[PDB]
């Protein structure tokens, strides 16, 4: 049944003592109508709100000491922290909005987006369609909020539902939470998971068409379905159909890839336009603003990057035409990246939330590419994308190195990429297909050891995650090939991370019903060791 106790009586829901029922809260500026209803292993708080709810407090309870917190987007940590020893992070002004969509919170208080967990307990919002749902630890209390970013609603709109789940099996609760999210959002969980190649983690921005063609030819000896060109081909951020260097046209690239027998894939950052791009210089009015001027969304590639205003029909028509063109060229796999830009707070043509704008953008992309195109989100708000993407990057960038000296701050490192694949495992086959980022299996031009390559690869396999390789294929020999083969034999199961609240970077992961039967891998991300059991 449902959690009952002294701790449940101590909570407040919209400022009211917690109990089951149906309630109305009329304030100066807003009205909320909500129900507190029993569900399996928990309570669901749902309802509707009108007026100017602003930063709306939904739930308040005493903070646990140890909490699993979650960043709103792909690259940000999902990790256990000590809620009482928390000190605000230094916020990088070039990357504010990767850290938080409400950075005023993160500068003062511990923040968790969408959900937070403790041993035996999960608090989780089922959707982010209009509001941004988050938790803050405020002077020793856990507070759940729905952020409406100053938008007013003349008529009722639905609250994002909040569940409070209790059971000693914390992994089970996170899986249940994720099943509910999936149902709430009509999640896409493809029956088939693509394999493939990605340029980025060998060539980076220095990819050439000449190196691409060499890899296209070698890829015929590898079990790759998709062949994906990453960042490098494009003249500027926003100018997706203008190529640079020795690259032919985007259309020509797709024709060569498909002639060679692969599904063509391509990277874009579709909600981003650089200060130097044609599209921005032609259409300065297409971006999110602040005090009526272009608002920097982030800085990357040594340029100010602006966010497209996805409330504008002109912008949506441009995006539709871009992605429709890509589809007509033969691209059927789309890595759409830096998606957080589309949800930055600021001034938009329409008075809608940044989450409402974001969802209009990704829905447009989905309509343009069609149902038989695979969409892989990256650098993306997680909950708002459920129902639209097929796959989602759920960790920071991996790297051809373990990252001994790299802090847990979203900078590239195999070690922190893999941690997130583990701690967000429960989203897989519920929200979408989890992308744990690319396997790096080459045995030159890398500092990864054989054991580190095995650890990363076999973990991803056990988790049933997407398996994409990113290497100069000339440099992948017997070991690399064997690791890929054995990885693919570990797919197909239902994984569980048995000790999700671990604080020592050691994880016990089982998966039932894989192509190799019931398997278990125990990993130590500090010593870089694993123990794998099969059958
Ligand atoms: O230093 N950074 O905060 C940062 C952030 C993101 C990032 O990777 C993204 C960019 C790109 C290309 O620009 C790749 O597609 C990655 O797979 C994607 F995860 C990288 N990166 O792998 O260079 C670096
Ligand atoms: Mg599966």
């Amino acid at each position: 049944l449902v959690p009952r106790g002294s701790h449940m009586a101590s909570m407040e829901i919209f400022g009211k003592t917690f109990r089951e029922g149906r309630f109305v809260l009329k304030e100066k500026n807003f009205t909320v109508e909500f129900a507190v209803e029993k569900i399996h292993l928990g309570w669901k708080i749902s309802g509707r709100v009108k007026g100017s709810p602003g930063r709306l407090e939904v739930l308040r309870t005493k903070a646990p000491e140890k909490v699993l917190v979650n960043n709103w987007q792909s690259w940000g940590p999902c990790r256990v922290v000590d809620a009482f020893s928390f000190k605000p992070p230094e916020i990088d002004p070039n990357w504010r909005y990767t850290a938080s969509v409400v950075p005023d919170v993160l500068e003062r208080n511990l923040q968790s987006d969408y959900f937070v967990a403790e041993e035996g307990k999960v608090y989780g919002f089922l959707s982010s369609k209009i509001a941004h749902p988050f938790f803050a630890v405020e002077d020793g209390e856990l507070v759940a909020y729905l952020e409406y970013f100053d938008v007013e609603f003349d008529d009722f709109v639905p609250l994002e539902p909040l569940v409070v789940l209790e059971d000693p099996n914390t992994p089970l609760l996170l899986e249940k939470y994720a099943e509910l999210v999936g149902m709430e959002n009509n999640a896409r969980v493809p029956k088939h998971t693509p394999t493939g190649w990605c340029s980025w983690y060998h060539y980076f921005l220095d990819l050439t068409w000449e190196e691409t063609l060499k890899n296209l030819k070698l890829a015929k000896n590898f079990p790759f379905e998709v062949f994906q060109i990453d960042d490098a081909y494009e003249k500027d951020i926003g100018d997706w159909l203008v190529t640079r260097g020795d690259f032919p046209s985007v259309e020509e690239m797709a024709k060569v890839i498909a002639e060679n027998g692969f599904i063509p894939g391509i990277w874009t950052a579709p909600f981003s336009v650089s200060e130097t791009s044609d599209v921005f210089n032609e259409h300065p009015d297409w971006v999110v603003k602040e005090n009526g001027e272009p608002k920097m969304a982030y800085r990357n590639w040594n340029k100010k990057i602006y966010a497209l205003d996805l409330s504008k029909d002109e912008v949506l028509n441009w995006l539709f035409d871009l992605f429709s063109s890509l589809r007509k060229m033969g691209y059927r796999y789309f890595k759409i990246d830096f998606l957080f830009a589309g949800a930055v707070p600021g001034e938009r043509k329409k008075n809608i939330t940044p989450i409402q704008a974001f969802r209009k953008g990704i829905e447009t992309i989905r309509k343009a590419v069609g149902e038989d195109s695979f969409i892989l989100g990256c650098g993306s708000p997680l909950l708002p994308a459920v129902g639209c993407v097929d796959g989602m990057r759920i960790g920071p960038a991996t790297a051809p190195f373990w990252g001994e000296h790299i802090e847990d701050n979203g900078a590239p490192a195999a070690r922190w990429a893999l941690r997130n694949a583990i701690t967000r495992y429960f989203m897989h086959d519920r929200f979408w297909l989890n992308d744990p980022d690319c396997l790096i299996l080459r045995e030159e031009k890398t500092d990864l050891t054989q054991k580190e390559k095995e650890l990363y690869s076999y973990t991803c396999g056990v988790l049933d995650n997407m398996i994409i390789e990113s290497d100069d294929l000339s440099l992948v020999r017997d070991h690399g090939k064997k690791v890929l083969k054995e990885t693919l034999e570990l797919l197909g199961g239902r994984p569980r991370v048995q000790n999700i609240m671990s604080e020592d970077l050691r994880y016990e992961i089982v998966s039932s019903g894989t192509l190799s039967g019931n398997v278990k891998i125990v990993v130590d991300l500090n010593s870089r060791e694993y123990h794998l059991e099969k059958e």
Side-chain angles (χ1 to χ4, degrees), residues 359-378:
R359 286 175 56 93
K360 290 157 64 66
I362 54 171
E363 286 164 3
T364 298
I365 294 179
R366 167 49 77 192
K367 286 190 206 169
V369 297
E371 287 303 301
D372 65 352
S373 287
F374 197 92
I375 301 182
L376 169 63
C378 190

Side-chain angles (χ1 to χ4, degrees), residues 55 127 169 213 216 313 315 410 433:
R55 179 172 293 164
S127 69
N169 190 341
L213 289 181
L216 193 54
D313 293 330
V315 168
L433 306 179

